[PDB]
């Protein structure tokens, strides 16, 4: 399952004739594209590798 979430603030005089706004005209743009399932689990780093990436000397 994939989730696309969006939040922002729009100025009405920027809405086109077809009731549409490009996302570059939204003020406090919060965009999110995430997912779940094992396809998403196969893209998190292992806890040991995550620990090493932060605490390894080099």
């Amino acid at each position: 399952t994939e989730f696309i979430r969006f939040s922002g603030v729009v100025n009405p005089r920027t809405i086109s004739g077809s009731n549409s706004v490009p996302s570059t005209q939204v003020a406090d743009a919060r965009i999110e594209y995430v997912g779940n399932g094992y396809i998403n689990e196969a893209q998190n780093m292992g806890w040991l590798q995550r620990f090493f990436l932060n605490l390894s000397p080099m």
Partner: protein, 58 residues
């Protein structure tokens, strides 16, 4: 000048080479909608803005 009592032969050299330099650069391209948070005494506008994206991992 007998017995090579006046013969002579000498050599000498000297060299030096120094150099240096530096440079810097930067670019930036995009679009972002900001908001007015204060109107100054001469009509200028103080603007602030933030955009947050989250593509699938971070």
């Amino acid at each position: 000048f007998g017995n090579s009592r006046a013969d002579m032969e000498a050599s000498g050299g000297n060299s030096f080479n120094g150099k240096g330099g530096a440079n810097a650069s930067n670019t930036f391209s995009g679009t972002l909608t900001v908001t007015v948070d204060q109107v100054l005494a001469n009509g200028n506008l103080h603007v602030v803005g933030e955009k947050q994206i989250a593509i699938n991992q971070g």
